[PDB]
Each structure stands twice: as C-alpha cells, then as structure tokens.
Amino acid sequence: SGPVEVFITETPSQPNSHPIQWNAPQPSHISKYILRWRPKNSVGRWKEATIPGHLNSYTIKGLKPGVVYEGQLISIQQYGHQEVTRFDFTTTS
Numbered sequence: 001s002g003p004v005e006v007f008i009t010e011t012p013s014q015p016n017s018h019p020i021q022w023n024a025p026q027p028s029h030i031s032k033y034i035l036r037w038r039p040k041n042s043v044g045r046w047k048e049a050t051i052p053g054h055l056n057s058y059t060i061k062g063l064k065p066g067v068v069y070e071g072q073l074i075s076i077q078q079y080g081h082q083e084v085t086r087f088d089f090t091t092t093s
Contacts, residue, residue, distance in 0.1 A: 003085040006073050015093035021057040022073055022085070030044035030083065032076040035060060040070040040088060051085040065093035 006022035013019055024030060031053050037060060038046035051058045063069070073085040 001027050001077070002083055003024055004030075004033075004073055004075055004083075006087060008087070008089045010089075010091070013059070014061075015091055016061060016063050018060045018063055018069075018089060018091050019057065020060060020071070020073075020089065024056060029077055030041055030075045033056065033058075034074040034076065035071065036074065037069045037071045038062075040068045062086055063091050065091055067091060 002025055004019065004022045004024060009019060009021045011019050014091055020035070022033070033051045033053065034048055035051060035058055036046060036048035049058070068088060068090050070088045074086065076082045
C-alpha cells in the first residue's frame with residue numbers, strides 16, 4: 001500500500017520505447033498497476049495501459065522522442081481503494 005518506488009529508467013532500447021521499472025511495497029494490498037502517461041505540454045487526452053501485479057516493469061512503446069511525459073502509476077487495491085504514485089519521465093534521443 002501507498003506510493004510505489006518508481007524511477008526514471010531507460011535501459012538500452014529505442015527512444016520511442018520507455019522501459020520504466022517500479023518496486024512494490026511489502027504488503028500485498030496492491031493488486032494491479034495501471035500506468036498512464038500524457039505528454040507534458042497540454043493537459044488534454046492521454047493514454048493508459050493495465051499491467052499485471054506480478055510484473056514490476058513495463059515498456060511504454062509508441063512514444064515520441066525528445067519529449068517530457070508526466071506519468072502516473074496508479075496501483076489498484078484488492079477491490080477497494082486505489083493509490084496513486086505521480087512523477088514525470090523523459091524520453092530522449
């Protein structure tokens with residue numbers, strides 16, 4: 001439970017790809033992860049994916065190079081509440 005330990009990782013891949021990694025808390029009160037991301041320019045329409053709870057990393061593909069995204073890793077609980085982790089990351093070429 002609570003905000004996840006998520007970092008701006010970008011291991012050798014494409015600049016259109018962004019392999020983020022997060023590290024979970026110790027209680028198993030968190031089930032799913034949703035990653036959502038919006039290019040931090042406008043605050044308009046944005047994208048999301050749903051990542052399973054066993055996977056602690058995700059590759060956000062189909063992005064633009066050299067742009068800043070604001071990203072949120074929302075962690076849904078066991079049919080209850082949901083927690084929100086907020087950050088920004090950069091994709092760079």
